[PDB]
Amino acid sequence: TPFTHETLPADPKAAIRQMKQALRAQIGDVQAVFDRLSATIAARVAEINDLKAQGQPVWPIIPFSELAMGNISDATRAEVKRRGCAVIKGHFPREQALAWDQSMLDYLDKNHFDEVYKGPGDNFFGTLSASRPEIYPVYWSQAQMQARQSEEMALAQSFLNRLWQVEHDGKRWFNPDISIIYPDRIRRRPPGTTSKGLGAHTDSGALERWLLPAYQQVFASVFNGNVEQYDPWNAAHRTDVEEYTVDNTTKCSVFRTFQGWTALSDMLPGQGLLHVVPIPEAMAYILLRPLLDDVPEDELCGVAPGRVLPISEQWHPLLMAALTSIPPLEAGDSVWWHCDVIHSVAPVENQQGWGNVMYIPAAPMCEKNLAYARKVKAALETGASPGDFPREDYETTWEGRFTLRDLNIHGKRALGI
Ligand SMILES: [Fe+3]
């Protein structure tokens, strides 16, 4: 269309305007489609609420033993697809997790982190009420890389990728059985912590969801009214997207089937825990909401370039009605959500125990993810901040960092070597 942009429009408001007009036209009665969509989603909220009342976790719980032994049922596979998230209990033995956590402590301590730390290096969350989640951003601890290349991450990554339709056109969109090392940050909250949390948002692009041609491809069924034809699990064209780049701002130049993390400490109920909207199709609602006629013509319900896409009660009351907590967790567990899934971190006052996690996603091998992987390997040598992240570069100088010679067979392959 005349309406799309592959690079960041010089005039966002102008571009948003034209996209809206083009789209209202291509859909017909937007409000009728939104209502239909909402009835399906309202019905899911009924499911979710029902389960909550019973005493169930809403998150599919999948024991790592079954995963490891290939004995996951069809019903479970199905449930993870319905819910868009999964907990892997016992992903790692508690010992191993706790020992990792301790190595983290000493790695930070021995390189004098708390002294040196200047940031946040970034303002990715300016669109959120709770925009300050508790002190990050290191990449190359032995703990992290080990978990990343660990054989039992590989099992989980592969199992997860497998949930996506891969075949479609030109036989295969990515290889679901190798995943790249995507070095990410950590989340470290000590007992006593008080925090606003992280406000509900989705990752992997904001404005580009509407304006990028690849996303017009991905969400065709949405942007043409056949909302029910739309399949969250179809990899079609996801690997053709490339997010807009904004000076020194967090972006994600990689395709992630799931985001997740591995817990380094026990997570106790109410202690400012990860919540998710377990309805991966919600993205449809996010996409149609600004098209409705109570929203200003040049606006996308808070979306701004170089900022995470915000989800709020103001614009998305139904989706907010669906927020659900992770169950309580023991160290070594790990949690996963579909890349289009709305999520947040609840606030705590005076937190019991630690709230430590390592960020490790499933990002499957493909021409796109490999391009980034080639870049990662360069960073891993120097210890610099991976390109996708603010150039803080704290570890370039540190002792006890994971290095090139310490790689797995997995690791060498995940970085394509
Ligand atoms: Fe997020």
DSSP 196-234: --EEEEE-S-STHHHH-HHHHHHTHHHHTS-GGG--TTB
Q: Which helix (H) or strand (E) holds 153?
A: helix 151-161
Q: What is the DSSP string of 243-286?
A: ----TT-----S--SEEEEEESS-B-TTSS-EEE---GGGHHHH
> Residue 357 in contact with residue 264, Cβ under 8 Å?
yes
For Cα atoms 338, 342, 348, give the angle at the middle one, nearest 5 degrees. Answer: 115
In whole angstroms, give the CA distance from residue 222 to residue 216.
9
For residue 131, report the distance from its CA to the centre of ligand 1, in Å: 11
Residues with CB under 5 A from ligand 1 (ion): 203
For residue 343, report the distance from its CA to the centre of ligand 1, in Å: 6
**Tokens coding 178:** 């190798």
For residue 26, report the distance from its CA to the centre of ligand 1, in Å: 31
Identify which of 19, 119, 118, 88 has the alpha carbon closest to the alpha carbon of residue 360: 88
For residue 213, report the distance from its CA to the centre of ligand 1, in Å: 23
For residue 32, report the distance from its CA to the centre of ligand 1, in Å: 31
For residue 203, report the distance from its CA to the centre of ligand 1, in Å: 5
For residue 340, report the distance from its CA to the centre of ligand 1, in Å: 10
- CATH code given to domain 1-417: 2.60.120.330
What separation in angstroms does the CA of 372 have from each of 66, 252, 365, 366, 410?
32, 10, 10, 10, 17
For residue 202, report the distance from its CA to the centre of ligand 1, in Å: 6
For residue 171, report the distance from its CA to the centre of ligand 1, in Å: 31
User: Given in angstroms, what resolution was this structure solved at?
Assistant: 2.9
Q: Tell me the β-bridge partners of 87.
A: 61, 335
For residue 160, report the distance from its CA to the centre of ligand 1, in Å: 18
For residue 123, report the distance from its CA to the centre of ligand 1, in Å: 13
For residue 112, report the distance from its CA to the centre of ligand 1, in Å: 28
